[PDB]
Design a protein around this nucleic acid. Structure first.
Ligand code: MG
Ligand code: MG
Ligand code: MG
Ligand code: MG
Ligand code: MG
Ligand code: MG
Ligand code: MG
Ligand code: MG
Ligand code: MG
Ligand code: MG
Ligand code: MG
Ligand code: MG
Ligand code: MG
Ligand code: MG
Ligand code: MG
Ligand code: MG
Ligand code: MG
Ligand code: MG
Ligand code: MG
Ligand code: MG
Ligand code: MG
Ligand code: MG
Ligand code: MG
Ligand code: MG
Ligand code: MG
Ligand code: MG
Ligand code: MG
Ligand code: MG
Ligand code: MG
Ligand code: ZN
Lengths: 75, 116, 136, 177, 50, 66
RNA sequence: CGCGGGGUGGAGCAGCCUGGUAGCUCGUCGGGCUCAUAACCCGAAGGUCGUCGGUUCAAAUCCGGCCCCCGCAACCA
RNA sequence: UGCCUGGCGGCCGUAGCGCGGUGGUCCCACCUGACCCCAUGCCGAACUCAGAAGUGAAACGCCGUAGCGCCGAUGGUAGUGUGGGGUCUCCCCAUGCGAGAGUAGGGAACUGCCAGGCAA
RNA sequence: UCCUCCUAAAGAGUAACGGAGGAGCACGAAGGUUGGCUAAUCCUGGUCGGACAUCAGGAGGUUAGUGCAAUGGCAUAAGCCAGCUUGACUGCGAGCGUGACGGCGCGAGCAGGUGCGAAAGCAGGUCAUAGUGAUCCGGUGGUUCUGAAUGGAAGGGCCAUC
RNA sequence: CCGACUUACCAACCCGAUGCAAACUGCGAAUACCGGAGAAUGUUAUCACGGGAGACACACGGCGGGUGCUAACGUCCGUC
RNA sequence: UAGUCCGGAUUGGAGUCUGCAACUCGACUCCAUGAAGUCGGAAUCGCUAGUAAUCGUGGAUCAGAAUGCCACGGUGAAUAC
């Protein structure tokens, strides 16, 4: 009855904290919204957080619900 | 509650406004004394603040709880903000329906030169 | 036999039995049968070690069963080649780790309970011991 | 609003002496009045609910809100979002006119009227009675209807208990058997 | 399945068209979408075709 | 309120057969004729006749006559 | 062990594919006809849809476990 | 400069609930009324406007109380990277890392920009 | 063949006739934007009304809902209702993710033109991840690009598309 | 009909106490992996482009697991 | 032309008569209530004249207690090829 599975979507966090990225570079390839769009970081329809500016990634824990955010300090 | 329901209606436009990095004109309304102030993009301090609670504005009004009083605020904020050099701002309703005093405050600010 | 009423999934992994137990103190009763040796107790063994335990201390006294199986063990039929899937769940075991109080008794003399837990220890595979409820 | 002034002058002080309120605003006041006519039988006849929405326009003086089914339940054969009932929430000055017309001429005209119930409270301060006939009201001319369709009136107050809400409604003379 | 595919034809001079689907058995009216016609380049009221 | 959706709501003259003319707003039409108002309904005597009615000994003493 | 079908008033069978409402014949019960029975005519009742759970607004039905029955398969050395 | 109050934040349960007390000069909320702006898939509840007699009940703010929530060591234990050993379905030894729970205890927040009221 | 979880040993990936379940669509609105709103289930009371229709309040708190299986996520709501609407748009696209490759996915911003909103802004489909097949061959509309002597045409090419 | 009391019994939900989970998480390592800086060390051990390949039956031991009977010099993966 | 001023059952209350005695178990009266039933499935009965049909009365039995039985008269058909 079993024997079926999907093709791994290669999710996860591509660029980590302190890592210099470029404009448009994908920071996090996620399913839902584990990580949120902080500063200088957009959010696609795939809920994929990309970098809207040159700089470095900076994970944070702001908000009244301790939800994860991802900012970018221009470096 | 009537007060807390208003805060969630504001959150939509507050959070969207700081990512953009805009200088918002936060307008607070009340059955008496319509308030107003311009806050820097840092979200911490105000730069220009004018309302009817100031004796400089209330003493030139019939009642500090209506349209012509609200029109007196918008002109005052837009003329002292054009003193500090703050030209292009954003208008944050603070959850208030843009129709009466919150509309009159903008109309007085749009004509002064406050760009929005 | 102690068996779970409708668990979430029918079959489950083998899983290792490493570590030491948590339900170590005598809580409800005053005397216990702490398990010294690591192993796995079927629902047949727990049930069998109770009948010949609830016989030595008559209708009096109260016996607590600190263990519950909740782990299905598969068994392939005879003459069946390997593969073709997981077998059929036949019995339910309880992973017993060292220091797991198996039974607790209360309402009886200590020497009687000392002899009751000698009858039950002979029905279980794991090596046990007799422990006493300590003051904190 | 004839008996609204009756409230603002006599009823308030009448309650101030009975529970020594340290505020004039602490006195109970009836907030609103809801006229529920949850017909239900509209699954068979669509015009049945349409007629029910007409009688609320007569008993009250305003248009009713045809309510939809919150959840679909097959025990009664209804579905999610199917028009099942009609309510009228009247307040402002138009509630007092109804509140008067209710207890002055409508309540006395109730068939086999012995009295209301003093236990019909939700332990908070709200009163909820139910009428069986709709003809007890002046508007229904008896020769323009074909159903014994009655409704149930809920009276919401600003009380904090049924012990106190009973005191507010006592001043309006309410029969109360 | 039932949702067949049709062709939204521009009411302008050109024969440019946006193709799309439409449930025929449930919807009896035709589509009159105002879409951008890359030839005339304004925004023309398209109409359903096959 | 929303104009032109609610019925005609005009003041009328209501008067029961006890001289109690009471003017109130309604949606009836021109006027009204009442039967029993709240100041004339027999509720003040309603409880009296159903509660205190029983007794069989008093019934029987009108038969023994002595 | 596997594949496929079935289990519905007291009997034998439709309905299940494509969910909300279960029907036919016999038998039973009551009445009539006849000297009486059978036949014949009239009227009505009667179903936990094997069983437990789940999906759903709603399960006889759709899905799964178990029990019973039926046919097929259970092979090459 | 200090107590107050309102707005926008920082930080986001040591920061939130429960119970009790308490504030109205300002402010805030409630509140009065509704031709008109606008309004309810009915209704000035909400939204809105025009004002303001009354109130601090409600709401919100503030102070106390730990009845809860919550935070939380030291030590030990569980686990474990690397190298060895054993009665090797599991452990032990050497070195490094070191939880979770629980305990002592902490605890009913802290703070910045502006604009008013107030004693000065 | 594709999608979800576990197996999978805290980056990604990772096998078996291992364990558990789905898809071969739906929608012109269930899309866009603007404004507003926020549950399930119980408890109490109430005409027909009943374990469960509609109504009022409290408790509770997101245990609800999300077109569909599962997981991640969601009130700043992506959940619910309403007004106006077609951005379910053309030409692109720095820069990245993912694969042997074919290929798939994300994308700020630029120009034309458009919708909603007072405005900031947002919209090139839908909370996301399934709903799908390469090439060839041939059909359909457009575009003088070519068109085997020359002028046309047939037929090819390019674009859209079956 | 209303409807009170009672019971050799079973028991919803809350509360205190006690265990279990690959498909549970109000917590949470060690390692591993990604990025930056720094020294030493290594015949550049690195990446890209081009010529030529072979190889795509793997086995055993340790550790972490699925399957089997925590059976198999069993079978299938991760890593050495 | 309706379940109606049709129909009168049932039931509550208050009464009367006979009788030692009216609860089980009488008849009649007053007020109230006012259902079934809107010409009846298969099937089946009576009757040819003053009969059928319909109306009312009397008597026996009997303290009281009939729509039964026996008897009387009023109005008075249809059809028999
Ligand atoms: Mg597989
Ligand atoms: Mg997967
Ligand atoms: Mg016979
Ligand atoms: Mg207070
Ligand atoms: Mg420690
Ligand atoms: Mg082993
Ligand atoms: Mg700790
Ligand atoms: Mg493949
Ligand atoms: Mg992984
Ligand atoms: Mg949607
Ligand atoms: Mg919104
Ligand atoms: Mg009830
Ligand atoms: Mg109820
Ligand atoms: Mg939406
Ligand atoms: Mg979806
Ligand atoms: Mg081919
Ligand atoms: Mg030529
Ligand atoms: Mg804790
Ligand atoms: Mg790993
Ligand atoms: Mg590194
Ligand atoms: Mg380096
Ligand atoms: Mg090969
Ligand atoms: Mg191979
Ligand atoms: Mg192994
Ligand atoms: Mg091998
Ligand atoms: Mg291998
Ligand atoms: Mg009578
Ligand atoms: Mg009838
Ligand atoms: Mg004869
Ligand atoms: Zn009167």
């Amino acid at each position: 009855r079993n024997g079926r599975d999907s093709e791994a979507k290669r999710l996860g966090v591509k660029r980590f904290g302190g890592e210099s990225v470029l404009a448009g570079s994908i920071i996090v390839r996620q399913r839902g919204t584990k990580f949120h769009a902080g500063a200088n970081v957009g959010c696609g329809r795939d809920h994929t957080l990309f970098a809207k500016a040159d700089g470095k990634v900076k994970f944070e824990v702001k908000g009244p619900k301790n939800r994860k955010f991802i900012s970018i300090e221009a470096e | 509650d009537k007060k807390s329901a208003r805060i969630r209606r504001a959150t939509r436009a507050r959070r969207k406004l700081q990512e953009l990095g805009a200088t918002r004109l936060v307008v607070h309304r009340t059955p008496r004394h319509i308030y107003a102030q311009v806050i820097a993009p840092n979200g911490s301090e105000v730069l220009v603040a004018a309302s009817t609670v100031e004796k400089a504005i209330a003493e030139q009004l019939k009642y500090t709880g209506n349209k012509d009083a609200a029109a007196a605020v918008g002109k005052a904020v837009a003329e002292r903000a054009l003193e500090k050099g703050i030209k292009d701002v954003s208008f944050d309703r603070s959850g208030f329906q843009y129709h009466g005093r919150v509309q009159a405050l903008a109309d007085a600010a749009r004509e002064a030169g406050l760009q929005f | 036999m102690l068996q779970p009423k409708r668990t979430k999934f029918r079959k489950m992994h083998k899983g290792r039995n490493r570590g030491l137990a948590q339900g170590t103190d005598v809580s409800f009763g005053s005397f216990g049968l702490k398990a010294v040796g690591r192993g796995r107790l079927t629902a047949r063994q727990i049930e069998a070690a109770r009948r010949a335990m609830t016989r030595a201390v008559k209708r009096q006294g109260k016996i607590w069963i600190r263990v519950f199986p909740d782990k299905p063990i598969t068994e392939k039929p005879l003459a069946v080649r390997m593969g073709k899937g997981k077998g059929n769940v036949e019995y339910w075991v309880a992973l017993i780790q060292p220091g797991k109080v198996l039974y607790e008794m209360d309402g009886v003399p200590e020497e009687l309970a000392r002899e009751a837990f000698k009858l039950a220890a002979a029905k279980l595979p794991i090596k046990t011991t007799f422990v006493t409820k300590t003051v904190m | 609003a004839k008996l609204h002034d009756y409230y603002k002058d006599e009823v308030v002080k009448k309650l101030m002496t009975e529970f020594n309120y340290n505020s004039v605003m602490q006195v109970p006041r009836v907030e609103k009045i809801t006229l529920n006519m949850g017909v239900g039988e509209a699954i068979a006849d669509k015009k049945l609910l349409d007629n029910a929405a007409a009688d609320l326009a007569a008993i009250s003086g305003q248009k009713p809100l045809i309510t939809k089914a919150r959840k679909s339940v097959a025990g009664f054969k209804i579905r999610q979002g199917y028009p099942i009932g009609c309510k009228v929430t009247l307040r402002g000055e138009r509630m007092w006119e109804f509140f008067e017309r209710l207890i002055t001429i409508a309540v006395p005209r109730i068939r086999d009227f012995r009295g209301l119930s003093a236990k019909s409270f939700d332990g908070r301060g709200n009163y909820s009675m139910g009428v069986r006939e709709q003809i007890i009201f002046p508007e229904i001319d008896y020769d323009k209807v074909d159903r014994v369709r009655g409704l149930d009136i809920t009276i919401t107050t600003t009380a904090k208990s049924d012990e106190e809400g009973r005191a507010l409604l006592a001043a309006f003379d309410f029969p109360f058997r | 399945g039932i949702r067949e595919k049709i062709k939204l034809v521009s009411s302008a001079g050109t024969g440019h068209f946006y193709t799309t689907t439409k449930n025929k058995r449930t919807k009896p009216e035709k589509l009159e979408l105002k879409k951008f016609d890359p030839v005339v380049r304004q925004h023309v009221i398209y109409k359903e075709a096959k | 309120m929303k104009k032109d959706i609610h019925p005609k709501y005009e003041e009328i003259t209501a008067s029961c057969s006890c001289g109690n003319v009471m003017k109130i707003r309604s949606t009836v039409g021109h006027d009204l004729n009442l039967d029993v108002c709240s100041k004339c309904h027999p509720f003040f005597t309603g409880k009296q006749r159903d509660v205190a009615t029983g007794g069989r000994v008093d019934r029987f003493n009108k038969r023994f006559n002595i």
